[PDB]
Amino acid sequence: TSQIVLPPHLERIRERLAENIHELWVMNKIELGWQYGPVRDDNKRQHPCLVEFCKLPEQERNYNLQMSLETLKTLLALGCHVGIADEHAEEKVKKMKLPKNYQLTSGYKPAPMDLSFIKLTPSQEAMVDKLAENAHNVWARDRIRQGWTYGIQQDVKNRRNPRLVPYTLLDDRTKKSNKDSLREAVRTLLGYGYHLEAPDQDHASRAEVCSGTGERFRIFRAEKTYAVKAGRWYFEFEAVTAGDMRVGWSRPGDLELGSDDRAFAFDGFKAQRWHQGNEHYGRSWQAGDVVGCMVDMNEHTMMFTLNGEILLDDSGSELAFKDFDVGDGFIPVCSLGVAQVGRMNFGKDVSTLKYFTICGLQEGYEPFAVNTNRDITMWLSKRLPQFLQVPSNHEHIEVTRIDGTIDSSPCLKVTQKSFGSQNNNTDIMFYRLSMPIEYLMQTSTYYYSVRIFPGQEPANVWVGWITSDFHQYDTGFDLDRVRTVTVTLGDEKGKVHESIKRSNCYMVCAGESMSPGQGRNNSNGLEIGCVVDAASGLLTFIANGKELSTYYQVEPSTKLFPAVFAQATSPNVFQFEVLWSRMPNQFLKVDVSRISERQGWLVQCLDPLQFMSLHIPEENRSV
Amino acid sequence: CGQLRPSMMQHLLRRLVFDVPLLNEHAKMPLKLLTNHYERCWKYYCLPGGWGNFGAASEEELHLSRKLFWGIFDALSQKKYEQELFKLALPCLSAVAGALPPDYMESNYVSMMEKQSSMFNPQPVDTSNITIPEKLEYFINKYAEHSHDKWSMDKLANGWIYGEIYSDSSKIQPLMKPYKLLSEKEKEIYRWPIKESLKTMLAWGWRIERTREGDSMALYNAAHGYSPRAIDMSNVTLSRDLHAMAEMMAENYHNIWAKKKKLELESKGGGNHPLLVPYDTLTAKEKAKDREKAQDIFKFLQISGYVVSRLSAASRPLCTGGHASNKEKEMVTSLFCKLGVLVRHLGQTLDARTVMKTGLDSVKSALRAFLDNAAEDLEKTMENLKQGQFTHTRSQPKGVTQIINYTTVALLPMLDKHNVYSIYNTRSSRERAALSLPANVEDVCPNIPSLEKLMTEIIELAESGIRYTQMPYMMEVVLPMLCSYMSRWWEHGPENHPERAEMCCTALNSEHMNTLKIIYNNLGIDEGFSQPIINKVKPQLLKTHFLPLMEKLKKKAAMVVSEEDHLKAEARGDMSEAELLILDEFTTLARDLYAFYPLLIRFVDYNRAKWLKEPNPYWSKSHNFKREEQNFVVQNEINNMSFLITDTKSKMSKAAISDQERKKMKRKGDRYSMQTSLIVAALKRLLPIGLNICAPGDQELIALAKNRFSLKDTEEEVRDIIRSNIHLQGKLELGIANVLFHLEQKSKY
């Protein structure tokens, strides 16, 4: 908490306030029960802080003035107005506050004041919490600078202080003393005639209740082969935590559920449905509630039974959806928001269903999975991106292979394909496309390349190679290269030998500035396709005519389909001469059972498991 | 739907602003009405600016259809997009300011609910004595070099090459030389448009940005080293302020060109050109040139980072809505003071009516707008508005102001700081003057008002004015004492004893609750600290004393019994919010009484069901309800078999009988749907008796509706007559129809 510096305009009131409150603390210390001592010793019940202002050392007074100044600057710069409203009852006004309560001890003791009849505003509690947090922060940084009562590489002493974390590692029971001191201080400040406001209230929206975006969205779906064509099927979805839970039926064939007409969903968090827009229908549920999505292909009506009660919209219609095409059937679908837990029940057993006798049996309803002898199988959205997709139809992709290498060979490959966008398309995506296409005095073979037009450079488009495993789909990239993982294998006794350095999923050159020439046109020797005749861990794939220490020596067996990185809006820069995460995926069905026991944390698995992979040609398939 | 911009309404406006057509204005209003819906709200880019400029230039004109078009457009613009006002706040404020001088004629000055969005110049500027500051050293030279390179590259594309001797036949251009050695005339020609643009931009006055990170002069990828290059810098999106600056520069350029055309036409002594056309009327042929010029200006201003640029967190400091609300309060207060000074000792009443229709109501969802608009001055402004409305309704009202007053008073329950401002003095004075409505029927009221004050209007207004069901907001100083006074007065008088045309005096108070033959006066005199209503002994004693009154309340009369039952229900309402769950035995007793009272009421035949306009919604109660339903089903079946044969008189009697039966069915079905949830919850677990009792009722209901025509045709007129609808099916906690959620729940079993 350090925003601005207190201006030197309130120096007189600041000094008067500091002097009287310091007097208040030193009388409080005097009346605590200790006594003044010429020397410092805890065994004699003597404390150096119990010294009157006339005999206090200069260092202690300077430290007191400094902490008073820092605290006043913090409370002034927090955001609340701390202007003078009522004058203090010292040498300016007399309001009988000081002689209200008087105490006599063995020494000088003036009459203090204690005003507690005023209402305890939450602003005082906020001030106390902020001051305690500031004290914990300065204590933690003081410990960090000097390394006291802990040790990482030194271990000077044991019994580490739990003061490192100012909020979680510290409990209010341990900090009762300074909490009480802060409460007394703010009570005396209230008694002095000072007005304060609480920002964390309904008057001002200074606090944020939700923070997030459309990320980490998982859609749970069933098999495409389990679609239905007739009859009525019932299933229950027990909602545990209220939140974004869109439940309905999806038609097979990233995207938010219910955005278009492919799938239907319902949710009570906003108590409205999603089908090609926003329509008010139904009501909010609570914890331990079911939805009960119904389907009836005989007359194409959809309804929902919330705890045995049919939900109705504002128009008083019992049918949620009407006049929809049958298509290739519908399958159960669920959506789970951030920190939300669901519970599916396809109807394996009659006794498992809760709200089934109330509405199901009388109307002639059957569970969705009442006839299946085997366990049901369900899919989920794959959060990890994969490159195993060729872009067939997109919003602005018009790929068309043209071959003109016969006779006329201007660029050998002679291929044109429109890959640029139209307008409002910038979400940093990485492109990948399929490839259905010793000698003396030679330089390199396989003279093929992907054409680009580096005449604009909107965001310093990077060019380089790509490894087999890329799971770093993030907006920010090319700032750390994941990690420069190095291997120092060897004897490691008195000499290090054969310390071969490895590489992570980072084979893309930065290409910030090849040369300060600024050549015209667009052809400047871009990503020339060159492969060394003999494999030695070095490949010549660069977009510049000069070498800049980018050898990147690694192990062989890395060649795959081409992929390049780019970011723009609509310059039609990408030509030939996508990462998705909405693909369904199933985790497991034969998950093992593990047993954990106290005092050892033993885990046992006596059931072996086995599964195989694919053997598709081109010698690369395992999904 | 248009492609990029329409040019129809501009032509329609240009034709309506003059009276060349005669009786032809009716051939374009349907065109405008049809084309308004075709075009979306995103097609209005320059049209709102021209509309605002024309409204500011002239507010009152002979074009009465303009307000109709504005109202239609604003009513049809209430979509789900919820577009921002942006530039709409100025024309609405100007119209509000200028609407006072107009008098009253036509209905064009009534539909003000759309206000506040439900919440040639030949010489524009003069640069005769404007000097360009000498802040240019390098960027102008770079721009001139780029322009020369582009021009020479364009001339090279045509087939011109650099040479030493100029020759048009050989296509030789010796101008391919650096700008440091170019001719003075060519340099001046190239510099003149740039100098004029710089002078125009510096004439108005705007901030200039000189950030060091904007140095993008050389960032994109012949003789004396002449190597021209082509740079495509039109792919960069630019801010809206620079777009507006470029639009203003283009407008100035077009005005200058039009002035030059006018000068060259005047010098020739004759001629005309059809190019004197505004931007919104321009065609694509000149639109392409305008877009090219705008792109060139954007590319010119994008290099070197030259960007041209032009309070407290409260409604008063910077929010336009808070300013508009405060201003509207100011004018309504000024008008109220003027009316109270002049009238109280022509178009004034008209403008007063317009400003009370517009000032009092601004949005249908007034509660959310008030909650999200302000919290400090909202209460005092509402209190001032209520006081002004009360003072204006004190005198004789000409028009009907009941609905607007009810809408204004309904916003009180949905805290207000009544300690800062006390505006309850007028309400307390009115309550004191009307402390006994059956007893103060005399000339005590000023001017002897037969219907201005001594009528049902004040009784109906008191229901909406006093409503604290959600949370109390009064000072709790005189309101509890006044409530105790009204309770004591109603206790003293068991009958109504009202005046003529005042039978519905039950709907008078909606806050009959504790601390919200009495000895209240003695307690107040003795205390005058703690009010006697603070103790819970007094409400309990009052309830125990009152209980025999409705315990023994049973009469066979028609109107006096009905009005006594209504008064007992109102004075003993079930909204006991003072710890309802704590007094479990009292709650059960009240529920039993309020469930047994309708049974004893409906025990009689009750051929007339118009006495109760809207009645207030265990095993013994369920059995009694089932017995009553079975008895009424038997009676209805008997009536059906009696009316099957022995045809009655003309259709008037049959229609009246069917209407009475429909009213009785609706009245019974209200309670049936109210108790259906409880019956279903009782029968769901282990009770089959409820279903076994409801099955004959469902069978009788199905048989009655199996074949009926007179009921079918009279249901429509019964629903039309009873405009009040409850619609309690959606709450799940023509008031009712034949088939609703209750029927589906009953048939579900």
UniProtKB/Swiss-Prot annotation, chain B:
Post-translational modification: Channel activity is modulated by phosphorylation. Phosphorylation is increased in failing heart, leading to calcium leaks and increased cytoplasmic Ca(2+) levels.
Phenotype on disruption: Embryonically lethal. Embryos die at about 10 dpc, due to defects in heart tube development. Cardiac myotubes display enlarged rough endoplasmic reticulum and cytoplasmic vesicles that contain high levels of Ca(2+).
Subunit structure: Homotetramer. Can also form heterotetramers with RYR1 and RYR3. Interacts with CALM and S100A1; these interactions regulate channel activity. Identified in a complex composed of RYR2, FKBP1B, PKA catalytic subunit, PRKAR2A, AKAP6, and the protein phosphatases PP2A and PP1. Interacts directly with FKBP1B, PKA, PP1 and PP2A. Interacts with FKBP1A and FKBP1B; these interactions may stabilize the channel in its closed state and prevent Ca(2+) leaks. Interacts with SELENON. Identified in a complex, composed of FSD2, CMYA5 and RYR2.
Comment field on protein domains: The calcium release channel activity resides in the C-terminal region while the remaining part of the protein resides in the cytoplasm.
Sequence repeats: 116-221, 222-310
Phosphoserine: modified positions: S216
Name of the protein this chain belongs to: Ryanodine receptor 2
Tissue and organ expression note: Highly expressed in heart, lung, cerebellum and brain. Detected at lower levels in adrenal gland, stomach, thymus, esophagus and ovary.
Shown segment, full-protein numbering: 2576 to 3566 of 4966
Protein task: Cytosolic calcium-activated calcium channel that mediates the release of Ca(2+) from the sarcoplasmic reticulum into the cytosol and thereby plays a key role in triggering cardiac muscle contraction. Aberrant channel activation can lead to cardiac arrhythmia. In cardiac myocytes, calcium release is triggered by increased Ca(2+) cytosolic levels due to activation of the L-type calcium channel CACNA1C. The calcium channel activity is modulated by formation of heterotetramers with RYR3. Required for cellular calcium ion homeostasis. Required for embryonic heart development.
Domain of life, source organism: Eukaryota
Cellular compartment(s): Sarcoplasmic reticulum membrane
Family as reported in the entry's similarity comment: Belongs to the ryanodine receptor (TC 1.A.3.1) family. RYR2 subfamily.
